[PDB]
Amino acid sequence: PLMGGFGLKNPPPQILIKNTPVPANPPAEFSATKFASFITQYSTGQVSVEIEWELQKENSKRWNPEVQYTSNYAKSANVDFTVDNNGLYTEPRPIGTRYLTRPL
Amino acid sequence: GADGVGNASGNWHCDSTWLGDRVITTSTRTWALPTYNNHLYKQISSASTGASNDNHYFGYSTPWGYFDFNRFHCHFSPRDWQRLINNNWGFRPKRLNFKLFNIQVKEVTTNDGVTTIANNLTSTVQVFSDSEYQLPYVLGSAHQGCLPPFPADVFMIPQYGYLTLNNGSQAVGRSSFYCLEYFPSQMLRTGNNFTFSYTFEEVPFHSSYAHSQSLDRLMNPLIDQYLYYLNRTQNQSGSAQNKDLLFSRGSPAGMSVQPKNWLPGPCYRQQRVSKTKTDNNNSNFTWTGASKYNLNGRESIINPGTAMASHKDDEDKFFPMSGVMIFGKESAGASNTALDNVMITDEEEIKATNPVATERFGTVAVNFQSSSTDPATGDVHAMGALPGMVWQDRDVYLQGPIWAKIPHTDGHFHPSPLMGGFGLKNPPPQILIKNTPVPANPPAEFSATKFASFITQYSTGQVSVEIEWELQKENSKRWNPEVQYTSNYAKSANVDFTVDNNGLYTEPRPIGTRYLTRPL
Amino acid sequence: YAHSQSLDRLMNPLIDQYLYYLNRTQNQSGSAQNKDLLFSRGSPAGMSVQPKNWLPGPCYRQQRVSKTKTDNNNSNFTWTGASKYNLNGRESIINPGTAMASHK
Ligand SMILES: CC(=O)N[C@H]1[C@H]([C@H](O)[C@H](O)CO)O[C@@](O)(C(=O)O)C[C@@H]1O
Ligand SMILES: CC(=O)N[C@H]1[C@H]([C@H](O)[C@H](O)CO)O[C@@](O)(C(=O)O)C[C@@H]1O
Ligand SMILES: [Mg+2]
Numbered sequence: 001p002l003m004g005g006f007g008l009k010n011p012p013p014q015i016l017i018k019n020t021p022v023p024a025n026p027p028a029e030f031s032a033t034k035f036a037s038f039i040t041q042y043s044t045g046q047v048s049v050e051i052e053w054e055l056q057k058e059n060s061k062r063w064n065p066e067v068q069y070t071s072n073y074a075k076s077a078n079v080d081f082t083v084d085n086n087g088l089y090t091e092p093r094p095i096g097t098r099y100l101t102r103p104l
Numbered sequence: 105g106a107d108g109v110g111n112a113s114g115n116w117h118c119d120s121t122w123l124g125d126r127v128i129t130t131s132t133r134t135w136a137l138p139t140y141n142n143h144l145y146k147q148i149s150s151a152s153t154g155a156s157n158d159n160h161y162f163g164y165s166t167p168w169g170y171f172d173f174n175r176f177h178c179h180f181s182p183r184d185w186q187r188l189i190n191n192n193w194g195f196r197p198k199r200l201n202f203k204l205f206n207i208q209v210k211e212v213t214t215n216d217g218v219t220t221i222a223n224n225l226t227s228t229v230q231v232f233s234d235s236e237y238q239l240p241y242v243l244g245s246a247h248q249g250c251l252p253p254f255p256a257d258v259f260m261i262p263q264y265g266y267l268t269l270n271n272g273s274q275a276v277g278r279s280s281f282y283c284l285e286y287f288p289s290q291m292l293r294t295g296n297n298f299t300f301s302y303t304f305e306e307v308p309f310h311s312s313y314a315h316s317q318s319l320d321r322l323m324n325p326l327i328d329q330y331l332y333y334l335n336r337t338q339n340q341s342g343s344a345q346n347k348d349l350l351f352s353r354g355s356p357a358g359m360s361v362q363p364k365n366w367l368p369g370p371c372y373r374q375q376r377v378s379k380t381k382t383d384n385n386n387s388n389f390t391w392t393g394a395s396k397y398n399l400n401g402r403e404s405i406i407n408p409g410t411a412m413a414s415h416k417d418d419e420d421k422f423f424p425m426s427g428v429m430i431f432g433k434e435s436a437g438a439s440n441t442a443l444d445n446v447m448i449t450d451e452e453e454i455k456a457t458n459p460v461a462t463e464r465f466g467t468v469a470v471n472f473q474s475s476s477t478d479p480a481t482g483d484v485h486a487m488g489a490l491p492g493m494v495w496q497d498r499d500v501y502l503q504g505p506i507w508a509k510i511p512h513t514d515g516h517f518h519p520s521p522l523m524g525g526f527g528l529k530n531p532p533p534q535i536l537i538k539n540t541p542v543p544a545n546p547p548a549e550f551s552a553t554k555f556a557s558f559i560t561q562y563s564t565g566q567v568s569v570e571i572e573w574e575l576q577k578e579n580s581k582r583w584n585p586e587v588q589y590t591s592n593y594a595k596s597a598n599v600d601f602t603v604d605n606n607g608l609y610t611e612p613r614p615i616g617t618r619y620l621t622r623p624l
Numbered sequence: 625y626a627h628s629q630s631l632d633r634l635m636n637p638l639i640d641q642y643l644y645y646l647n648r649t650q651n652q653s654g655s656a657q658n659k660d661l662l663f664s665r666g667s668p669a670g671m672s673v674q675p676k677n678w679l680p681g682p683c684y685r686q687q688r689v690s691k692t693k694t695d696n697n698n699s700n701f702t703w704t705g706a707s708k709y710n711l712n713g714r715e716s717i718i719n720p721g722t723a724m725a726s727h728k
Contacts, residue, residue, distance in 0.1 A: 023136040024221055025212045025562045026260050030169075030639060032248040034608070035136060035258040039221060148637055158672035163637050245635040246643045246666065246675055265638040268628045280628035377646070381659045388650035391673075399680045401728035404632045407645055407675040429675070430644040432665055438640065439664035440652055446644050446663045488682070503642075508677045511631070521677040523643075 019043050058100050066100050107295040109225050114205025114297055117568050118255055120184050125577060127188070127195075129179040130570040133251050133259060135171075137229065137563045140263045143167045143541040145283070148265065151273035158403050162275045163267030168284050168538035170264045171202075173569045174243050176502050177253035177611070182601040185502045189617045190588050194309025194576030197507065200532055200569070204231055204298035207565035209539065214560070223294075228540040229563045231298045232289035233533045237509070239282055240266035243534055244508030246523060251569070253503075254609035264536060284536055291540065302533070307526045309576045310500055312617035315456040316582070317624035319366055319494065320359060329354025331363045347475075368465070369458040369495025372410045373485040374424035376462035379443065383421075394426060408522055411498040412461035414451045423448055424461035429523060431503050434610050453618045454496040459487075489517065500524040502615040507531050539563050578620050586620050631678055632671060641666025643675045684722045 001007050022039040060066070071080050083089050107113050118132045144167060150160040176185065188195060209227035213220050234241075242264065249262025268279035290298050323329075332351045339348035354362040374395045378384055396403045407426035415422045429449045436445035459465050465484035473479035497520045500506070508521030509531045519527040542559040580586070591600050603609050635641075644663045651660035666674040686707045690696055708715045 020206075020566075021134060021258055022208070023134075023258055023562075023564045025210070025219075025560070026136045026138040028138055028140065028142075030140075030249065030263050031260055032262070032640075032642075034252075035260060038258075153669075155669065156672070159670055161633055161637060161668070161671055163633070165638050240629060240634075242634075242636040244677060246641045247636055247639040248642045249639055250642075262636070262639050265636045266629075267633040267635070267637055269630060270633065278626050278628055377649070377661075379661070381661055384649060384659055384661075386650070386657060386659055388648055390646050390649055397680055399632055400630065400725070402632060403672060404676065405645070405673045406679070407673070425646055426675075430646070430663065431642070432644045432663070436644070436663070436665075438667065440647055440662035441644075441664070443661045443663070511634075511678055515681070522679070523675060523677055 162270035178251040203568035314453040371459035413455035
């Protein structure tokens, strides 16, 4: 997939969720016209996702140290990848995956 | 079934599974049931009003409502209809599975302008099916209130009423009154569910085909017959007009006089009216020129009547006045709406076997010709069953009825329900549903006078119907391609059989079943 | 037994039909008598025009005669006005004939 990732013949499928409509009180005489009057309602719940990933171990015979991703040892007003004083989490930079190296 | 209040009692089973010679459809819809009639039965009459003797009626309205899944779009999605009509020669019902679940009774309180609707967790809706057909069968009369075509559409449950004998507005000693509290019925709180299953009797497959041949074109066009017919009664090659008796044998150059084995179907002519208003008479003849029947000094139009072709070859503009089924579009009003708010069906593909409804049946001798008395023929406008007759019953439509109960009579001739479908000795039974009345607070002193004060309440739930249909496969040895039903490849602002931008599903044309063909 | 219901009174009197029938051929609410094609759906206020599934039984009409001699014709019609059948150039009265109701 051009934006990065795994192109799948049969990916994980979509999970469609809907609240069942709850009609409010119909008239006392019959009316075959579509029902347009419903209790306003919303739902909340939790959702759980467990994913097992395989890892490919690094077997590199490189002598010198590789480049590694690291938070900045030095001081600053904000830890990286945290809430601030209002409670807002913020992701400060994009983190990719290519840090270890191997021969071509 | 027994379940806590917080515990679904059924799942949303809706689907479309084909296997071999069988198609199993299942459709689930959600229903609203109100209190009807204020938990009362009420005698209903044509009293007052002054409705014409034809319209006089006597009967009852009931606190119960009923379920009605007697239309094909209840269980066949249009694309499934296409699979049926495009590849099968026939089909019929076989079994049925019904379920009531997730029922929620709610209480309603109105104070000033504001209304509040809360859950009543102890209230019960009661369902029972009339499996012994002890109640007047009101299904099979093309009423509204059926399951909606679009599964996401929520429908109100129609109210049950019936009728009995009436002389004018008055009743008669034999007329019958039915209390649905007299039958045993299943009571359900929000935790309970309800189910039953039904088997259809053996009935013939419906004719999802047209004839590639007509009754008058069954012979071999290359081979004279050995039969002879009287050809002339006045001499050919005579200088005067001299009497003769000249016989000719059957020949392809005259298919119209060849002896034949069969007769077309029965006819009961109806008035022909054009879809273009100009050609029609300047009068209001839909009653005075109506073909009607006469029962107990009371006239009732015949519609749709004996199954006949709708127009002949190249006369597409006509239709029988009461001899075709007409579906209203969603926009159409209830009375006196224009031509383009309705959809008129065209049963023209049966002109192969059946008379055209607007025309005579044939001609009949009505005297004894002699040298003195000129021969005479008259036209036939009503033709009852004759030996030899073959006929094709009126076709079914996605929007049309599925079945009907055959009246319980000493006698019936070819009891296909006239509006199309399967005539059943023991159809699927009615399912009657009612909300149990919930009395409000009685007085603190006793009063034996009938209780008239109840919590206003309505109920909602889902309903599930699974039907297994048999299919009759097409075995045709036709070389050329058959006619098939198809959406229009070209562009347009609206897909067929869809919601529009306001969310309204609309069925754009009536779809019948006769597309494949077989020999006669 | 007798039927507590009649063929033209089998429908539900509280529920319009979804079927439509051609109602008028001359315009309602027109100053003249102008041609029109107006359609109405089945309604309890008109049981007589609702599409129906069945037909009454076969009929073969017979002459009506009153039990009170005055109302009847001053002639001897029990043969000349008889409904009869014709077999081998020989006439024979139909009695009792196709099963029909005796009076309305
Ligand atoms: C094939 C056909 O319809 N034949 C019919 C003919 C034709 O009208 C003439 O042969 C015209 O050439 O007319 C008849 O009166 C005749 O003369 O015997 C009756 C016969 O049924
Ligand atoms: C219920 C009923 O019998 N309706 C009939 C009406 C009534 O006679 C008028 O509505 C009188 O109010 O007359 C028609 O010609 C019409 O106007 O459509 C035919 C229709 O069958
Ligand atoms: Mg499937």
